[PDB]
């Protein structure tokens, strides 16, 4: 077993954790440290700040790492563009197309 | 009735109504002739989203891919250890 965080890649750990769904549908192998970051929904915040793909939540402007398998399960792609975080995606965007036309 | 669901357009007047990306409800987005034509050509984000955040380069061909965007969801594959590829690149 090898931690699938590319900045880590360790084969030694006290506890093997599970991460994001890989292209196979299997869950990634992460070491204790990296898997703890993932479980707290702060993996990309701790390891991916130099990468492209960050967007701000449509409602609260929280930074969300898009185009990244490690945040795929915590990011919602919104109907009219943009992204919503775990909190703000319980709601839908009201754009000017909702106007009493119905 | 209809209004273009491309938020920078919002037109209600078009020669022909077309369909875009799937919405959460399962319905397809309404798009005017112009915006729907861009979606059909696989050029929607190039035509409308270049100044938005979220763009990444394909790991193989370096095509610019608009991530975190429902309108390009269909063409972008999230790679196992990070990054993206074109759907047609990533199978390699
Ligand atoms: Zn690790
Ligand atoms: Zn990330
Ligand atoms: Zn939010
Ligand atoms: Zn339009
Ligand atoms: Zn886009
Ligand atoms: Zn490519």
JSON list of C-alpha atoms and ligand atoms in Angstrom, two decimals:
[
{"chain": "A", "resi": 1, "resn": "UNK", "atom": "CA", "xyz": [0.00, 0.00, 0.00]},
{"chain": "A", "resi": 2, "resn": "UNK", "atom": "CA", "xyz": [1.22, 3.45, -1.04]},
{"chain": "A", "resi": 3, "resn": "UNK", "atom": "CA", "xyz": [-0.29, 6.78, -0.10]},
{"chain": "A", "resi": 4, "resn": "UNK", "atom": "CA", "xyz": [-1.83, 8.25, -3.26]},
{"chain": "A", "resi": 5, "resn": "UNK", "atom": "CA", "xyz": [-1.10, 11.85, -2.25]},
{"chain": "A", "resi": 6, "resn": "UNK", "atom": "CA", "xyz": [1.72, 12.54, -4.72]},
{"chain": "A", "resi": 7, "resn": "UNK", "atom": "CA", "xyz": [3.45, 14.92, -2.27]},
{"chain": "A", "resi": 8, "resn": "UNK", "atom": "CA", "xyz": [3.65, 12.02, 0.20]},
{"chain": "A", "resi": 9, "resn": "UNK", "atom": "CA", "xyz": [3.74, 8.60, -1.48]},
{"chain": "A", "resi": 10, "resn": "UNK", "atom": "CA", "xyz": [4.62, 6.83, 1.76]},
{"chain": "A", "resi": 11, "resn": "UNK", "atom": "CA", "xyz": [4.33, 3.07, 2.28]},
{"chain": "A", "resi": 12, "resn": "UNK", "atom": "CA", "xyz": [4.63, 3.25, 6.09]},
{"chain": "A", "resi": 13, "resn": "UNK", "atom": "CA", "xyz": [1.89, 4.44, 8.45]},
{"chain": "A", "resi": 14, "resn": "UNK", "atom": "CA", "xyz": [0.11, 3.50, 11.66]},
{"chain": "A", "resi": 15, "resn": "UNK", "atom": "CA", "xyz": [-3.31, 3.48, 9.97]},
{"chain": "A", "resi": 16, "resn": "UNK", "atom": "CA", "xyz": [-4.31, 3.19, 6.31]},
{"chain": "A", "resi": 17, "resn": "UNK", "atom": "CA", "xyz": [-7.23, 5.46, 5.47]},
{"chain": "A", "resi": 18, "resn": "UNK", "atom": "CA", "xyz": [-9.50, 5.83, 2.47]},
{"chain": "A", "resi": 19, "resn": "UNK", "atom": "CA", "xyz": [-9.67, 8.85, 0.21]},
{"chain": "A", "resi": 20, "resn": "UNK", "atom": "CA", "xyz": [-11.36, 9.93, -3.00]},
{"chain": "A", "resi": 21, "resn": "UNK", "atom": "CA", "xyz": [-13.00, 7.62, -5.56]},
{"chain": "A", "resi": 22, "resn": "UNK", "atom": "CA", "xyz": [-10.46, 6.73, -8.24]},
{"chain": "A", "resi": 23, "resn": "UNK", "atom": "CA", "xyz": [-11.37, 6.28, -11.91]},
{"chain": "A", "resi": 24, "resn": "UNK", "atom": "CA", "xyz": [-11.90, 2.57, -11.13]},
{"chain": "A", "resi": 25, "resn": "UNK", "atom": "CA", "xyz": [-14.50, 3.40, -8.49]},
{"chain": "A", "resi": 26, "resn": "UNK", "atom": "CA", "xyz": [-12.17, 2.12, -5.80]},
{"chain": "A", "resi": 27, "resn": "UNK", "atom": "CA", "xyz": [-11.27, 4.46, -2.95]},
{"chain": "A", "resi": 28, "resn": "UNK", "atom": "CA", "xyz": [-7.76, 5.88, -2.87]},
{"chain": "A", "resi": 29, "resn": "UNK", "atom": "CA", "xyz": [-5.27, 4.68, -0.31]},
{"chain": "A", "resi": 30, "resn": "UNK", "atom": "CA", "xyz": [-4.05, 7.42, 2.01]},
{"chain": "A", "resi": 31, "resn": "UNK", "atom": "CA", "xyz": [-1.78, 7.27, 5.02]},
{"chain": "A", "resi": 32, "resn": "UNK", "atom": "CA", "xyz": [-3.02, 8.32, 8.46]},
{"chain": "A", "resi": 33, "resn": "UNK", "atom": "CA", "xyz": [-1.92, 11.95, 8.07]},
{"chain": "A", "resi": 34, "resn": "UNK", "atom": "CA", "xyz": [-3.17, 12.50, 4.52]},
{"chain": "A", "resi": 35, "resn": "UNK", "atom": "CA", "xyz": [-6.38, 10.55, 5.16]},
{"chain": "A", "resi": 36, "resn": "UNK", "atom": "CA", "xyz": [-7.04, 12.70, 8.22]},
{"chain": "A", "resi": 37, "resn": "UNK", "atom": "CA", "xyz": [-6.70, 15.81, 6.05]},
{"chain": "A", "resi": 38, "resn": "UNK", "atom": "CA", "xyz": [-9.14, 14.30, 3.53]},
{"chain": "A", "resi": 39, "resn": "UNK", "atom": "CA", "xyz": [-11.69, 13.31, 6.19]},
{"chain": "A", "resi": 40, "resn": "UNK", "atom": "CA", "xyz": [-11.71, 16.89, 7.51]},
{"chain": "A", "resi": 41, "resn": "UNK", "atom": "CA", "xyz": [-12.51, 18.22, 4.01]},
{"chain": "A", "resi": 42, "resn": "UNK", "atom": "CA", "xyz": [-9.22, 20.14, 4.01]},
{"chain": "A", "resi": 43, "resn": "UNK", "atom": "CA", "xyz": [-7.01, 18.00, 1.77]},
{"chain": "A", "resi": 44, "resn": "UNK", "atom": "CA", "xyz": [-6.65, 20.41, -1.15]},
{"chain": "A", "resi": 45, "resn": "UNK", "atom": "CA", "xyz": [-6.38, 23.30, 1.26]},
{"chain": "A", "resi": 46, "resn": "UNK", "atom": "CA", "xyz": [-3.39, 21.55, 2.88]},
{"chain": "A", "resi": 47, "resn": "UNK", "atom": "CA", "xyz": [-1.65, 20.16, -0.23]},
{"chain": "A", "resi": 48, "resn": "UNK", "atom": "CA", "xyz": [-2.88, 21.78, -3.48]},
{"chain": "A", "resi": 49, "resn": "UNK", "atom": "CA", "xyz": [-2.61, 25.56, -3.03]},
{"chain": "A", "resi": 50, "resn": "UNK", "atom": "CA", "xyz": [-0.08, 25.92, -5.87]},
{"chain": "A", "resi": 51, "resn": "UNK", "atom": "CA", "xyz": [-2.30, 24.20, -8.44]},
{"chain": "A", "resi": 52, "resn": "UNK", "atom": "CA", "xyz": [-4.63, 25.62, -11.05]},
{"chain": "A", "resi": 53, "resn": "UNK", "atom": "CA", "xyz": [-8.38, 25.09, -10.81]},
{"chain": "A", "resi": 54, "resn": "UNK", "atom": "CA", "xyz": [-9.41, 26.96, -7.68]},
{"chain": "A", "resi": 55, "resn": "UNK", "atom": "CA", "xyz": [-12.81, 28.69, -7.78]},
{"chain": "A", "resi": 56, "resn": "UNK", "atom": "CA", "xyz": [-14.83, 30.57, -5.17]},
{"chain": "A", "resi": 57, "resn": "UNK", "atom": "CA", "xyz": [-18.17, 29.27, -3.91]},
{"chain": "A", "resi": 58, "resn": "UNK", "atom": "CA", "xyz": [-21.02, 31.11, -5.62]},
{"chain": "A", "resi": 59, "resn": "UNK", "atom": "CA", "xyz": [-22.54, 32.09, -2.26]},
{"chain": "A", "resi": 60, "resn": "UNK", "atom": "CA", "xyz": [-19.82, 32.29, 0.43]},
{"chain": "A", "resi": 61, "resn": "UNK", "atom": "CA", "xyz": [-16.64, 32.66, -1.73]},
{"chain": "A", "resi": 62, "resn": "UNK", "atom": "CA", "xyz": [-14.93, 29.74, 0.03]},
{"chain": "A", "resi": 63, "resn": "UNK", "atom": "CA", "xyz": [-12.13, 28.45, -2.17]},
{"chain": "A", "resi": 64, "resn": "UNK", "atom": "CA", "xyz": [-12.85, 25.09, -3.79]},
{"chain": "A", "resi": 65, "resn": "UNK", "atom": "CA", "xyz": [-10.31, 23.14, -5.78]},
{"chain": "A", "resi": 66, "resn": "UNK", "atom": "CA", "xyz": [-11.98, 22.27, -9.07]},
{"chain": "A", "resi": 67, "resn": "UNK", "atom": "CA", "xyz": [-10.76, 19.79, -11.63]},
{"chain": "A", "resi": 68, "resn": "UNK", "atom": "CA", "xyz": [-9.39, 17.79, -8.70]},
{"chain": "A", "resi": 69, "resn": "UNK", "atom": "CA", "xyz": [-10.39, 14.26, -7.80]},
{"chain": "A", "resi": 70, "resn": "UNK", "atom": "CA", "xyz": [-9.61, 14.98, -4.12]},
{"chain": "A", "resi": 71, "resn": "UNK", "atom": "CA", "xyz": [-12.48, 17.48, -3.80]},
{"chain": "A", "resi": 72, "resn": "UNK", "atom": "CA", "xyz": [-14.86, 15.84, -6.28]},
{"chain": "A", "resi": 73, "resn": "UNK", "atom": "CA", "xyz": [-17.23, 14.61, -3.57]},
{"chain": "A", "resi": 74, "resn": "UNK", "atom": "CA", "xyz": [-17.36, 17.95, -1.69]},
{"chain": "A", "resi": 75, "resn": "UNK", "atom": "CA", "xyz": [-17.97, 20.29, -4.66]},
{"chain": "A", "resi": 76, "resn": "UNK", "atom": "CA", "xyz": [-21.31, 20.81, -6.40]},
{"chain": "A", "resi": 77, "resn": "UNK", "atom": "CA", "xyz": [-21.44, 22.02, -9.99]},
{"chain": "A", "resi": 78, "resn": "UNK", "atom": "CA", "xyz": [-24.28, 24.57, -10.05]},
{"chain": "A", "resi": 79, "resn": "UNK", "atom": "CA", "xyz": [-27.00, 24.61, -12.73]},
{"chain": "A", "resi": 80, "resn": "UNK", "atom": "CA", "xyz": [-26.06, 28.02, -14.20]},
{"chain": "A", "resi": 81, "resn": "UNK", "atom": "CA", "xyz": [-22.29, 27.78, -13.83]},
{"chain": "A", "resi": 82, "resn": "UNK", "atom": "CA", "xyz": [-19.90, 28.03, -10.94]},
{"chain": "A", "resi": 83, "resn": "UNK", "atom": "CA", "xyz": [-19.61, 25.83, -7.89]},
{"chain": "A", "resi": 84, "resn": "UNK", "atom": "CA", "xyz": [-21.13, 25.51, -4.42]},
{"chain": "A", "resi": 85, "resn": "UNK", "atom": "CA", "xyz": [-19.47, 24.26, -1.23]},
{"chain": "A", "resi": 86, "resn": "UNK", "atom": "CA", "xyz": [-20.91, 21.66, 1.16]},
{"chain": "A", "resi": 87, "resn": "UNK", "atom": "CA", "xyz": [-22.99, 24.30, 2.97]},
{"chain": "A", "resi": 88, "resn": "UNK", "atom": "CA", "xyz": [-24.16, 26.54, 0.14]},
{"chain": "A", "resi": 89, "resn": "UNK", "atom": "CA", "xyz": [-25.11, 23.71, -2.26]},
{"chain": "A", "resi": 90, "resn": "UNK", "atom": "CA", "xyz": [-28.16, 22.87, -0.13]},
{"chain": "A", "resi": 91, "resn": "UNK", "atom": "CA", "xyz": [-29.58, 25.83, -2.09]},
{"chain": "A", "resi": 92, "resn": "UNK", "atom": "CA", "xyz": [-30.04, 26.56, -5.79]},
{"chain": "A", "resi": 93, "resn": "UNK", "atom": "CA", "xyz": [-29.07, 29.69, -7.68]},
{"chain": "A", "resi": 94, "resn": "UNK", "atom": "CA", "xyz": [-31.82, 32.21, -8.36]},
{"chain": "A", "resi": 95, "resn": "UNK", "atom": "CA", "xyz": [-30.97, 33.93, -11.65]},
{"chain": "A", "resi": 96, "resn": "UNK", "atom": "CA", "xyz": [-33.03, 36.41, -13.64]},
{"chain": "A", "resi": 97, "resn": "UNK", "atom": "CA", "xyz": [-34.65, 33.54, -15.58]},
{"chain": "A", "resi": 98, "resn": "UNK", "atom": "CA", "xyz": [-36.85, 32.93, -12.50]},
{"chain": "A", "resi": 99, "resn": "UNK", "atom": "CA", "xyz": [-39.10, 35.94, -13.02]},
{"chain": "A", "resi": 100, "resn": "UNK", "atom": "CA", "xyz": [-42.81, 35.08, -12.72]},
{"chain": "A", "resi": 101, "resn": "UNK", "atom": "CA", "xyz": [-43.05, 34.03, -16.37]},
{"chain": "A", "resi": 102, "resn": "UNK", "atom": "CA", "xyz": [-44.62, 30.64, -15.54]},
{"chain": "B", "resi": 1, "resn": "UNK", "atom": "CA", "xyz": [-41.72, 31.35, -22.10]},
{"chain": "B", "resi": 2, "resn": "UNK", "atom": "CA", "xyz": [-38.17, 30.31, -22.43]},
{"chain": "B", "resi": 3, "resn": "UNK", "atom": "CA", "xyz": [-35.15, 32.32, -21.41]},
{"chain": "B", "resi": 4, "resn": "UNK", "atom": "CA", "xyz": [-31.54, 31.50, -22.28]},
{"chain": "B", "resi": 5, "resn": "UNK", "atom": "CA", "xyz": [-29.92, 29.90, -19.22]},
{"chain": "B", "resi": 6, "resn": "UNK", "atom": "CA", "xyz": [-26.49, 31.19, -20.21]},
{"chain": "B", "resi": 7, "resn": "UNK", "atom": "CA", "xyz": [-26.36, 33.80, -17.48]},
{"chain": "B", "resi": 8, "resn": "UNK", "atom": "CA", "xyz": [-24.47, 36.39, -19.55]},
{"chain": "B", "resi": 9, "resn": "UNK", "atom": "CA", "xyz": [-27.17, 36.12, -22.26]},
{"chain": "B", "resi": 10, "resn": "UNK", "atom": "CA", "xyz": [-30.61, 35.72, -20.68]},
{"chain": "B", "resi": 11, "resn": "UNK", "atom": "CA", "xyz": [-32.35, 36.41, -23.99]},
{"chain": "B", "resi": 12, "resn": "UNK", "atom": "CA", "xyz": [-36.04, 35.62, -24.50]},
{"chain": "B", "resi": 13, "resn": "UNK", "atom": "CA", "xyz": [-35.99, 36.26, -28.26]},
{"chain": "B", "resi": 14, "resn": "UNK", "atom": "CA", "xyz": [-34.27, 33.80, -30.61]},
{"chain": "B", "resi": 15, "resn": "UNK", "atom": "CA", "xyz": [-34.82, 32.20, -34.02]},
{"chain": "B", "resi": 16, "resn": "UNK", "atom": "CA", "xyz": [-34.71, 28.71, -32.48]},
{"chain": "B", "resi": 17, "resn": "UNK", "atom": "CA", "xyz": [-34.56, 27.30, -28.96]},
{"chain": "B", "resi": 18, "resn": "UNK", "atom": "CA", "xyz": [-31.92, 24.65, -28.32]},
{"chain": "B", "resi": 19, "resn": "UNK", "atom": "CA", "xyz": [-30.78, 22.50, -25.41]},
{"chain": "B", "resi": 20, "resn": "UNK", "atom": "CA", "xyz": [-27.64, 22.61, -23.32]},
{"chain": "B", "resi": 21, "resn": "UNK", "atom": "CA", "xyz": [-26.23, 20.68, -20.38]},
{"chain": "B", "resi": 22, "resn": "UNK", "atom": "CA", "xyz": [-28.22, 18.49, -17.97]},
{"chain": "B", "resi": 23, "resn": "UNK", "atom": "CA", "xyz": [-29.60, 20.30, -14.91]},
{"chain": "B", "resi": 24, "resn": "UNK", "atom": "CA", "xyz": [-29.85, 18.75, -11.46]},
{"chain": "B", "resi": 25, "resn": "UNK", "atom": "CA", "xyz": [-33.56, 18.17, -12.09]},
{"chain": "B", "resi": 26, "resn": "UNK", "atom": "CA", "xyz": [-32.80, 16.00, -15.15]},
{"chain": "B", "resi": 27, "resn": "UNK", "atom": "CA", "xyz": [-34.17, 18.62, -17.53]},
{"chain": "B", "resi": 28, "resn": "UNK", "atom": "CA", "xyz": [-31.74, 19.96, -20.10]},
{"chain": "B", "resi": 29, "resn": "UNK", "atom": "CA", "xyz": [-30.84, 23.62, -19.95]},
{"chain": "B", "resi": 30, "resn": "UNK", "atom": "CA", "xyz": [-32.65, 25.96, -22.32]},
{"chain": "B", "resi": 31, "resn": "UNK", "atom": "CA", "xyz": [-30.24, 27.84, -24.60]},
{"chain": "B", "resi": 32, "resn": "UNK", "atom": "CA", "xyz": [-30.93, 30.30, -27.40]},
{"chain": "B", "resi": 33, "resn": "UNK", "atom": "CA", "xyz": [-29.80, 29.56, -30.97]},
{"chain": "B", "resi": 34, "resn": "UNK", "atom": "CA", "xyz": [-26.49, 31.37, -30.39]},
{"chain": "B", "resi": 35, "resn": "UNK", "atom": "CA", "xyz": [-25.55, 29.84, -27.02]},
{"chain": "B", "resi": 36, "resn": "UNK", "atom": "CA", "xyz": [-26.98, 26.44, -27.91]},
{"chain": "B", "resi": 37, "resn": "UNK", "atom": "CA", "xyz": [-24.96, 26.47, -31.12]},
{"chain": "B", "resi": 38, "resn": "UNK", "atom": "CA", "xyz": [-21.82, 27.10, -29.09]},
{"chain": "B", "resi": 39, "resn": "UNK", "atom": "CA", "xyz": [-22.70, 24.25, -26.72]},
{"chain": "B", "resi": 40, "resn": "UNK", "atom": "CA", "xyz": [-23.39, 21.88, -29.63]},
{"chain": "B", "resi": 41, "resn": "UNK", "atom": "CA", "xyz": [-20.02, 22.80, -31.19]},
{"chain": "B", "resi": 42, "resn": "UNK", "atom": "CA", "xyz": [-18.27, 22.00, -27.87]},
{"chain": "B", "resi": 43, "resn": "UNK", "atom": "CA", "xyz": [-17.15, 25.63, -27.63]},
{"chain": "B", "resi": 44, "resn": "UNK", "atom": "CA", "xyz": [-19.43, 27.05, -24.95]},
{"chain": "B", "resi": 45, "resn": "UNK", "atom": "CA", "xyz": [-16.79, 27.75, -22.32]},
{"chain": "B", "resi": 46, "resn": "UNK", "atom": "CA", "xyz": [-14.36, 29.12, -24.91]},
{"chain": "B", "resi": 47, "resn": "UNK", "atom": "CA", "xyz": [-17.02, 31.54, -26.14]},
{"chain": "B", "resi": 48, "resn": "UNK", "atom": "CA", "xyz": [-18.40, 32.61, -22.74]},
{"chain": "B", "resi": 49, "resn": "UNK", "atom": "CA", "xyz": [-16.22, 31.61, -19.77]},
{"chain": "B", "resi": 50, "resn": "UNK", "atom": "CA", "xyz": [-12.66, 32.67, -20.58]},
{"chain": "B", "resi": 51, "resn": "UNK", "atom": "CA", "xyz": [-12.50, 35.30, -17.80]},
{"chain": "B", "resi": 52, "resn": "UNK", "atom": "CA", "xyz": [-13.90, 32.95, -15.17]},
{"chain": "B", "resi": 53, "resn": "UNK", "atom": "CA", "xyz": [-11.87, 31.02, -12.65]},
{"chain": "B", "resi": 54, "resn": "UNK", "atom": "CA", "xyz": [-11.37, 27.28, -12.88]},
{"chain": "B", "resi": 55, "resn": "UNK", "atom": "CA", "xyz": [-9.35, 26.76, -16.06]},
{"chain": "B", "resi": 56, "resn": "UNK", "atom": "CA", "xyz": [-6.80, 23.93, -16.09]},
{"chain": "B", "resi": 57, "resn": "UNK", "atom": "CA", "xyz": [-4.68, 22.36, -18.85]},
{"chain": "B", "resi": 58, "resn": "UNK", "atom": "CA", "xyz": [-5.06, 18.78, -20.04]},
{"chain": "B", "resi": 59, "resn": "UNK", "atom": "CA", "xyz": [-2.13, 16.71, -18.74]},
{"chain": "B", "resi": 60, "resn": "UNK", "atom": "CA", "xyz": [-1.53, 15.26, -22.24]},
{"chain": "B", "resi": 61, "resn": "UNK", "atom": "CA", "xyz": [-2.40, 17.84, -24.92]},
{"chain": "B", "resi": 62, "resn": "UNK", "atom": "CA", "xyz": [-2.59, 21.02, -22.74]},
{"chain": "B", "resi": 63, "resn": "UNK", "atom": "CA", "xyz": [-6.04, 21.99, -24.03]},
{"chain": "B", "resi": 64, "resn": "UNK", "atom": "CA", "xyz": [-7.60, 24.52, -21.71]},
{"chain": "B", "resi": 65, "resn": "UNK", "atom": "CA", "xyz": [-10.47, 22.90, -19.81]},
{"chain": "B", "resi": 66, "resn": "UNK", "atom": "CA", "xyz": [-12.98, 24.89, -17.77]},
{"chain": "B", "resi": 67, "resn": "UNK", "atom": "CA", "xyz": [-13.28, 22.98, -14.50]},
{"chain": "B", "resi": 68, "resn": "UNK", "atom": "CA", "xyz": [-15.96, 23.46, -11.84]},
{"chain": "B", "resi": 69, "resn": "UNK", "atom": "CA", "xyz": [-18.36, 24.18, -14.69]},
{"chain": "B", "resi": 70, "resn": "UNK", "atom": "CA", "xyz": [-21.46, 22.20, -15.59]},
{"chain": "B", "resi": 71, "resn": "UNK", "atom": "CA", "xyz": [-21.19, 23.24, -19.24]},
{"chain": "B", "resi": 72, "resn": "UNK", "atom": "CA", "xyz": [-17.87, 21.36, -19.66]},
{"chain": "B", "resi": 73, "resn": "UNK", "atom": "CA", "xyz": [-18.57, 18.50, -17.25]},
{"chain": "B", "resi": 74, "resn": "UNK", "atom": "CA", "xyz": [-19.02, 16.15, -20.21]},
{"chain": "B", "resi": 75, "resn": "UNK", "atom": "CA", "xyz": [-15.51, 16.68, -21.67]},
{"chain": "B", "resi": 76, "resn": "UNK", "atom": "CA", "xyz": [-13.26, 16.65, -18.57]},
{"chain": "B", "resi": 77, "resn": "UNK", "atom": "CA", "xyz": [-11.90, 13.62, -16.73]},
{"chain": "B", "resi": 78, "resn": "UNK", "atom": "CA", "xyz": [-10.46, 14.03, -13.23]},
{"chain": "B", "resi": 79, "resn": "UNK", "atom": "CA", "xyz": [-7.25, 12.01, -13.08]},
{"chain": "B", "resi": 80, "resn": "UNK", "atom": "CA", "xyz": [-6.53, 9.60, -10.25]},
{"chain": "B", "resi": 81, "resn": "UNK", "atom": "CA", "xyz": [-3.71, 11.53, -8.54]},
{"chain": "B", "resi": 82, "resn": "UNK", "atom": "CA", "xyz": [-4.70, 15.09, -9.46]},
{"chain": "B", "resi": 83, "resn": "UNK", "atom": "CA", "xyz": [-5.20, 17.13, -12.58]},
{"chain": "B", "resi": 84, "resn": "UNK", "atom": "CA", "xyz": [-7.50, 16.73, -15.55]},
{"chain": "B", "resi": 85, "resn": "UNK", "atom": "CA", "xyz": [-7.44, 15.33, -19.03]},
{"chain": "B", "resi": 86, "resn": "UNK", "atom": "CA", "xyz": [-9.69, 15.64, -22.02]},
{"chain": "B", "resi": 87, "resn": "UNK", "atom": "CA", "xyz": [-12.12, 12.73, -22.03]},
{"chain": "B", "resi": 88, "resn": "UNK", "atom": "CA", "xyz": [-10.48, 11.72, -25.31]},
{"chain": "B", "resi": 89, "resn": "UNK", "atom": "CA", "xyz": [-6.94, 12.02, -23.87]},
{"chain": "B", "resi": 90, "resn": "UNK", "atom": "CA", "xyz": [-7.46, 10.45, -20.45]},
{"chain": "B", "resi": 91, "resn": "UNK", "atom": "CA", "xyz": [-8.26, 6.96, -21.78]},
{"chain": "B", "resi": 92, "resn": "UNK", "atom": "CA", "xyz": [-4.56, 6.61, -22.71]},
{"chain": "C", "resi": 1, "resn": "LIG", "atom": "ZN1", "xyz": [0.32, 10.37, 2.84]},
{"chain": "C", "resi": 2, "resn": "LIG", "atom": "ZN1", "xyz": [-7.08, 19.35, -5.07]},
{"chain": "C", "resi": 3, "resn": "LIG", "atom": "ZN1", "xyz": [-20.31, 28.25, 0.13]},
{"chain": "C", "resi": 4, "resn": "LIG", "atom": "ZN1", "xyz": [-28.23, 32.77, -25.15]},
{"chain": "C", "resi": 5, "resn": "LIG", "atom": "ZN1", "xyz": [-17.51, 26.91, -18.34]},
{"chain": "C", "resi": 6, "resn": "LIG", "atom": "ZN1", "xyz": [-6.20, 16.61, -23.99]}
]
